[PDB]
């Protein structure tokens, strides 16, 4: 609170060269991100604090209740939680350690054990990493892994070899496509 401008920000003391008649500076969105101290002639920027979205990977409720926490766009080695009973409480749950943290290009994931094995993508997370509830770790928990694109195959290509089948198999496939939807009417004066 310098001259009535209240809010939330962090001072960085940048090298912005303000003019004597200028004290406030706004961005494209007209949000004042840089102000001049009334007492000292130094320049201080107003940058917002740690902000980001959090997603909770949830397995089947009928199977188990153990869930993982994902911080989108957050690095694991910078701020995992960094709260002690006196910070934000939108999510009153803290996961500190447990060898469950893993750094991805999409953000920091907490609650999964990364393995070198590759399986089919069960729960889409981002950056090619998916999670699944496997019972081969025997205990069962949520593990993170890279999606498997398919079985590795190599064709024995040759300039004088050809493959011709000797038998066949009659296979039938199913394909469902929506045709119509529910026709609904809305009354104006009744609604």
């Amino acid at each position: 609170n310098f001259n009535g401008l209240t809010g939330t920000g962090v001072l960085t003391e940048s090298n912005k060269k303000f003019l004597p008649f200028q004290q406030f500076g706004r961005d494209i969105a007209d949000t004042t991100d840089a102000v001049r101290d009334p007492q000292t002639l130094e320049i201080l920027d107003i940058t917002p604090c740690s902000f980001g979205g959090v997603s909770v990977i949830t397995p089947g409720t009928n199977t188990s209740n153990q869930v993982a926490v994902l911080y989108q766009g957050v690095n694991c080695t910078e701020v995992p939680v960094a709260i002690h009973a006196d910070q934000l409480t939108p999510t009153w749950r803290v996961y500190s350690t447990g060898s469950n943290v893993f750094q991805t290009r999409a953000g920091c994931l907490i609650g999964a054990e990364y393995v070198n094995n590759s399986y089919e993508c069960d729960i889409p997370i981002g950056a090619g990493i998916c999670a699944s509830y496997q019972t081969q770790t025997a205990s069962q928990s949520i593990i993170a892994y890279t999606m498997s694109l398919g079985a590795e195959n190599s064709v024995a290509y040759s300039n004088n070899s050809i493959a011709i089948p000797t038998n066949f198999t009659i296979s039938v496939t199913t394909e469902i496509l929506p045709v119509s939807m529910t026709k609904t009417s809305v009354d104006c004066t009744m609604y």
Binding site: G53, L88, T91
Partner: peptide, 17 residues
């Protein structure tokens, strides 16, 4: 009852003063 997967966005982190 919650199905398998995220199925929604939980919340957004906002550091307070």
């Amino acid at each position: 009852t919650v199905e398998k997967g995220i199925y929604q966005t939980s919340n957004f982190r906002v550091q307070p003063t």
